[PDB]
Amino acid sequence: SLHMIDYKEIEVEEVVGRGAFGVVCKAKWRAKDVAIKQIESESERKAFIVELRQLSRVNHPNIVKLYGACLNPVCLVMEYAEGGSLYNVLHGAEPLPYYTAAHAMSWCLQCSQGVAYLHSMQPKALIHRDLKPPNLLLVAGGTVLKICDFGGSAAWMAPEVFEGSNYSEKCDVFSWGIILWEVITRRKPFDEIGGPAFRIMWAVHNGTRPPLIKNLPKPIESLMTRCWSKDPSQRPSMEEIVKIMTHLMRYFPGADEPLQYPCQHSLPPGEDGRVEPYVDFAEFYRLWSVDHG
């Protein structure tokens, strides 16, 4: 089932961006703020059809909603994420918003719920392959995460993918582990390396991982490091990550609070492979202690 939309019913506004193919503009349709993906060359037709068949096969609260599509000319109608991407929220232009440990943990749970859903696809699992914060959009005051694919990814790539190896849906698990580190620390992974992308590939292939987080709870540290293991078969499945993350949310109240506070940013270079979290874990420890201790 595909909701047919006539191009005359759409009021195309400003260009938002350009992915591997097509053009994404902001648009209006049925008294609502929408996103349109349109074709620029007759070459990208085959690629539009592939996108249209995959976007219309998927239905989950954490995967970008396709509203419908135009046929003449070919155009995709999507929900609009006013909050922009997660990368923009974390590392974008000033003023950047303040966020809590509950926000960081919720975003990652929602990402795992969306990926577990993709991995459960019948008759064949859907592997994202490009899980990273520029591919994650935020809605509902930055409280609700939506997985996208816009077509540099080195920092989040599992080493078996870039090594040429025949990989599995476990490459997404690796990518999720990196994003988890990223939302907790509010740092760009492997930013200190720099240079071209192959320098990141070289380090990660040689065993390099993001630095350890000071005062990071052991249940979270243990989950993070398993996700980024060299052996993909040692990484937990997304269903397990969903289960563990859902259980940990009990100690992370306040995820439904909108992002509305401005943050002032200072990033000191971490020494001895150890960094400070951006988020505060004092409340997690207090709430864990009431239950355990």
Residue 161: φ, ψ to 5°: -70, -55
CB of 70 vs ligand YIY, minimal distance in Å? 13
Residue 134 vs 236, nearer CB to ligand YIY: 134
CB of 265 vs ligand YIY, minimal distance in Å? 23
**Half-sphere exposure (Cβ direction) of 246: Cα atoms closer than 13 Å:** 9
154 annotated ligand binder: no
Residue 102 vs 173, nearer CB to ligand YIY: 173
25 and 38 Cβ atoms separated by less than 8 Å: yes
20 annotated ligand binder: yes
53 annotated ligand binder: no
Residue 53 vs 265, nearer CB to ligand YIY: 53
CB of 75 vs ligand YIY, minimal distance in Å? 11
Residue 138 vs 201, nearer CB to ligand YIY: 138
22 annotated ligand binder: yes
CB of 3 vs ligand YIY, minimal distance in Å? 16
Residue 143: φ, ψ to 5°: -95, -25
The CA distance from 93 to 46, in Å, is 35
Is 256 designated active site? no
183 annotated ligand binder: no
Q: Is 58 exposed, middle or buried (0-12, 13-18, 19+ CB in 10 A)?
A: middle
CB of 1 vs ligand YIY, minimal distance in Å? 16
The CA distance from 22 to 45, in Å, is 9
How many beta carbons lie within 10 A of that of residue 138, not counting itself?
22
126 and 58 Cβ atoms separated by less than 8 Å: yes
The CA distance from 129 to 169, in Å, is 8
The residue nearest ligand YIY at its CB is 35
Residues that bind ligand YIY (CB under 6 A): 16, 24, 35, 37, 50-51, 54-55, 58, 63-64, 78, 80-81, 128, 137, 147-149, 151
Residue 82 vs 256, nearer CB to ligand YIY: 82
65 annotated ligand binder: no
Helices (H), the chain: 45-55, 86-91, 101-119, 159-162, 170-185, 197-205, 218-227, 238-248, 282-291
Catalytic residue of the set 130, 256, 280, 291? 130
**Half-sphere exposure (Cβ direction) of 54: Cα atoms closer than 13 Å:** 16
Q: Residues annotated as binding site?
A: 16-24, 37
Q: Residues annotated as binding site for ATP?
A: 16-24, 37
Q: Which residues are catalytic?
A: 130
